[model samples]
Target chain A: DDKTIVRDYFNSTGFDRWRRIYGDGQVNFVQKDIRVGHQQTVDSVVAWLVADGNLPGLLVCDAGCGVGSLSIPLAQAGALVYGSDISEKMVGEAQQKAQEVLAYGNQPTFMTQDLAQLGGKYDTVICLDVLIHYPTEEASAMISHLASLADRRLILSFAPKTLGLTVLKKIGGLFPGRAYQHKEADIRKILGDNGFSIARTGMTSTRFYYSRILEAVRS
Target chain B: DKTIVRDYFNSTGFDRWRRIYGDGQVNFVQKDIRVGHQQTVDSVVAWLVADGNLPGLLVCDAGCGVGSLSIPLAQAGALVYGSDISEKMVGEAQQKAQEVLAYGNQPTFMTQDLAQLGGKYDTVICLDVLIHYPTEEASAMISHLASLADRRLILSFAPKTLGLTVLKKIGGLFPGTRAYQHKEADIRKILGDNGFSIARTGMTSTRFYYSRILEAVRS
Candidate 1:
């Protein structure tokens, strides 16, 4: 997927679709499972940083942060969070949510930025679940690009390519999205070549959702 | 003569900081500073742990107050020299180390001005101290500290931002010493000019306390 198409899709019908999925409203069983799956992944990422109580003052970039799923909680924990999405509407929603949710004057900056155009140095760069849309080659390049912008860690989650999951998909247990599941081995090698090694690995799987998350560090 | 900072910390600011670093009893704002400070220190320690072997590394804790950063490194088997502009601060630091660290493993503490620090080190750390001097003098001091370290330099200072400036203006009623804030861009320029690139950049912000911390490596 190129930048423009991702932008259009997220900025259009996909925005509300995700907002509903991420919210506490009613949804399809598959969407509901995905929501819980994403939430579990977010919780794991936060635990990774907050375990040391080191979140305060951490300069973090939430690449493809859809309506602040991971961004708001990080900002609440005192991280200087820069949250971005390809969709302007999602950014506006995230910003408005921040104004209401954060400590006074402690809001993360949310803006419209396609993943390729997102620029800055951050202590941690986080991109979760968005890589499912990219092909393996594109995903590998994106991994390197995200690692380059980060000074310490890049926490990423993608739909994992596995024969077990392949069987699950074939049996109609896992709902498929605009599909590209990554080989975990390839991502590890790409990060290693970029001078990053996986410091933490986590999997959040439900009946309809399976995500492999890696906290890769370049320290 | 750089006497303003030295005199204030030795005389008026001595008791105030001693309570801050030791007794753990303080007003709400200072308590926030202590919390933010501990978080920043933990990040520094975490970075060092991830960076490689910590043992036998000769490190300098410039502007070391009460040996918070110094003692941890010392415990990790690094040779650390913790120095501050205030004799009282130096004394307190040494005292704190003796209370916990083994006699041989404790960081050596001495009264020394940042501008005139004399030593070669594997890493030099100056935390939450650059706020005492304006940008021009701070640049000179940072460059000096950078020169002493062949590999790593860690520094934290009050960052100048529009929002923080407003807070700084309101908090100008400090009883002991005048505070100065540094522009983040200027600090970045100084680091690059000294042949160091930031490996990790972070911030620690509380209600009244905010510090930008970075670790720069030889480039």
Candidate 2:
């Protein structure tokens, strides 16, 4: 059910709006906060990547690589990057954007692929702002899958559900955003169940935007 | 101008604060502040490592007290400058840092007021420091700190809120310890004037200790 809703939403309204928000384009303050929050997640993950070690040949798969927002940066940082998204349209835009932004070796290879179907091993796998669409069961299995694919690190950002933040999201929905928030405890449980121990975590927030990011490693 | 804060910390309140900030046996307020402030430091360090790209980066720990944030950041590989208005505070920071970090890895600790310190940094952090200044002076300090930061500035202050205000009046953790609560809007406006935009924000609190943290980046 969420897959259908997510695909249709991202392929349409969310697609055009997110592109503008993700780019250096004009946006209102509310949207700007979302831009900052999302970018902060990418920036944090990239910083973690650099801190982990040399990126020259690190294999990274950018799960839900929206318009190459993170994929392009990872590729530019000298990582061998792959980008996959559930929406083919999003994947196309990501490839188009990657071509223009990436200057290192080859640009990121992009494909239309669901997180559930995501396969192959990667040194790192990052899924940012995409997990909130799924219910707990689906999200858990998908995270387990993402963990299984990562040879070393799995970085993720999701809307963290807390009492106040949950109500805030409800108020935010009155303005037309869609999705669900996940519990911190559940996410941690999934990671631990999959044998991934958290290496670092952080939260980013603005007036109407909030996200919690976790970096997990097999170590 | 800040003689009161300098006078007290350098004289009447040095060792007490040192004990509160360090490994300690403390009373209720001290214990609460210690817990909350450590929580704040943990969050800030996590955020910094994720987004700060700590290794080899130049950073300033403005108003660093007893090497709390500075030592960890230095250990993360950032060359750091830790400064405080109280000479004793700086000396304690130096001593604490020396124990945790090697010579090259140790933060350069000095005694100086925020305004007197002049050096550019990739990021400048002032945690639990700005709450002491009134709005006007706090605004100026934000400007001065922003000027010293090539890319980022982070600060924390007591926010003007009814609950927090009442708590401060009722608890007033330290007798004769001057604390000023700042309007959130005033701080935001000051950052905007200095050409910095708020990137992330959070609040850390306890029964008595309260702080709102703002992370800003050059616009």
Candidate 3:
């Protein structure tokens, strides 16, 4: 039920809509808000890894990667990148974009793989703006699986559930796609149960988007 | 070995660390030390909570300076056992715990060498203490700390990078203070050799203090 809803939503109009929103162009107020949040998260994750001396020649998996947004930059930094998405169209677009940027160090591999189907271990695994599709219980399991794939670090960004955010989600529910969020406390516990510990955390909120980011490592 | 460490901590160092533990503002140096120490404590608290609830956990705070960390750990429902090389500092920590910390969950305080500490704990925390020792001794202490921790060990010390070590040397030129710093790679190697692996690391800097904080657990 959840996968069908997510697959159908992203494969249809949502794919094109998000592509435009994530594109580099002059944007409306709502688009600007979303763009600011997206950029901040991308910069923060890259900065954290570099600060920890984790960049260059490291293996990275960008799960639920949409349209090569983060993968391209990470590849440029000399990381071997694997990008995946649930939507076939999105994966196709990302792969096509990857070919154009062959000069940017390693060429990233893009594939259509659902989060549950994602496999293999990496030095780092990053999932950005993707957990909105899973409910809290499933999200916890998803986090554990992501942790398992990461040999050293796992970075995740999610729409965090709070009273203010809940109201905002309800308002956004008038749109076509369904969205869900996980409580920060619940997510932390799940990470701990999976033999990971939070190394750093950051929060970003714009008028249109809100996300909680965590960088964790295996214990 | 014991007399030099005991005398240094009991005299001028005792007065200095006590000011750092207390809320009474003294000078710029004290202010920065207080802020840096508090930030490290806050980071540790968040990390601990990320691991699990504090209730029913056994904690050891080695070289705990005047209950700053022990009291908070106790308040958060941990049954804490704290020790310091300075008898005066231990007395003050015990007094502070009696005045401020919750009953039953109160931290037990003692003046003892870290190498002499007995019993195992769910977590072991050693903050700002390793900076007083050079590499060989610090490595031994780290191994001893790993032995005492059943689950986790959180440590803080001055880092020995070429740049940071130079800074420490410049800072130590001031009267009445001496500094020792640890190389990050060597610390990691020591932990790994002692059956521990670093789960997380962070750095804190203030006007007067710079600390490298690490969270480790059994490998």
Candidate 4:
């Protein structure tokens, strides 16, 4: 039903390059034809972990990690990295890449687990640009799961659901493309419900690119 | 009582505009402004939305085409002048103004270009026009229009935003590739260059509509 429903009006043509470039199955973070610089994002996350005095040997989990793009990087940074994905294909692909890189001296681990089934706690949990797949209500649960797994900080991003954007999303859906889907208010509510206060947010380019990169920290 | 109330509705002051000249097409256009030029038209409408003192305030409707904006201005309690370059449009504006007066508003219509407006006004209104002037000429035209305002000015320009530009280009591309594109920046510059400081900015989110209701005192 899900496949048929989405298939009737979905655009997933860019999945191949998206997974390759972003190392996440859902590529194309911002709208196409406009690429936003994310150097500040990488630096900001690194700075936060270092500033919190929680960098070395800290247990960091890249939940829903696809293709080891983030898992390997975080593992190389000396954290005990734990990663997972709902897609078995993504997990196998990432594990293979991790083996090639000797990721984290083979300390990094990959598992096939849906975010909903995630358990245990970690010092830092970073899930960026991945939460727009579910409905608003389900998002609240997902945020709760992520928050529960993080001892200190949790970060993620979702597509803002606005009346204008909603209309645009439906139109985009018709073009065989998949977009982060949810309202800004819904995302905010989900995060706030999880007891993580938003520490900072990064807004992408105004025109052609409108996704937000948000970072939340445990109080 | 219901029928009496309904009948009494559009009788005096600004209500006269609703009574004398209100049509479904006009109402549809107004609703469209609320979405397309959401900010601009809303801003302009704030001052002349309802009835008030008409005899004392100077309200000039620039490019008052076919009395669309002129009659409304008259009904809204301003001593309104509907000016247009097309004699036909000006004649229609005058006729609409008389209809407004019959319904209880005082207004006048004149055939004149905004660049040649001589008298100062309390509230200057220009709506669904300005496409006639080029970018540079529109700037100069705005200066002349602003020159007439004693306290406030209301203006609505069409062909706003890139979407509208694209739509117009597409529509006109086949015909002759001749379409006016009056962007928000051009409008802002024209107003700013002429010493009109914007008090607020609102946007309506309908297609081919972008109006900026700028409240400015002529410096």
Q: Which candidate model has the greater DockQ, 3 or 4?
A: 3
Q: lDDT for every model? A: 0.80, 0.81, 0.80, 0.59
Candidate 1 similarity to native, TM-score = 0.54
Tens-place lDDT digits, model 3, residues B1-219: 557778988998789878877888778878887898897787677667655679878999999879888888888888889999899999999999988853657899998999889899989999988888878889889899899999888888876433454555787899754567776667767887878866555556556667777788886
A139-211: candidate 2 lDDT, tens digit per residue: 9988999999999989988887544556776788799654578888899999999988898998888777788
Estimate TM-scores for all models. Answer: 0.54, 0.54, 0.52, 0.41
Interface RMSD for all numbered candidates: 11.9, 16.9, 10.2, 22.1
lDDT per residue (tens digit) for residues B32-81 in model 4: 54344433443355544532455456677776655655555555666777
lDDT of 1 by residue, A1-219 (tens): 466677787778888888888776899998898798888898778667755445777899999888887888777556788998888988988887666544354458888887776778998999998888778888888888888899999888988764455676677845656467888898888889999988889998787778899988895
The Cα error of candidate 2 at residue B126, in Å, is: 1.1
How well does model 3 score by local distance difference test? 0.80
What tens-digit string does per-residue lDDT give for candidate 1 at B48-127?
A: 77657788888999999778899888888888888998998888888788888757687889888878889899999999
| Candidate 4, lDDT over the whole model | 0.59
List ranges where model 4 is wrong by over 4 Å: A1-219, B1-43, B49-55, B165-177
Q: Every model's DockQ, to 2 decimals?
A: 0.06, 0.02, 0.02, 0.01
DockQ of 1: 0.06
Query: What level of docking quality does candidate 4 show?
Result: incorrect
Report the lDDT tens digits of candidate 3 across residue range A63-166: 99988888876764446889998899888878776665443225688889987789998999999988887788888878888888999888988877545557
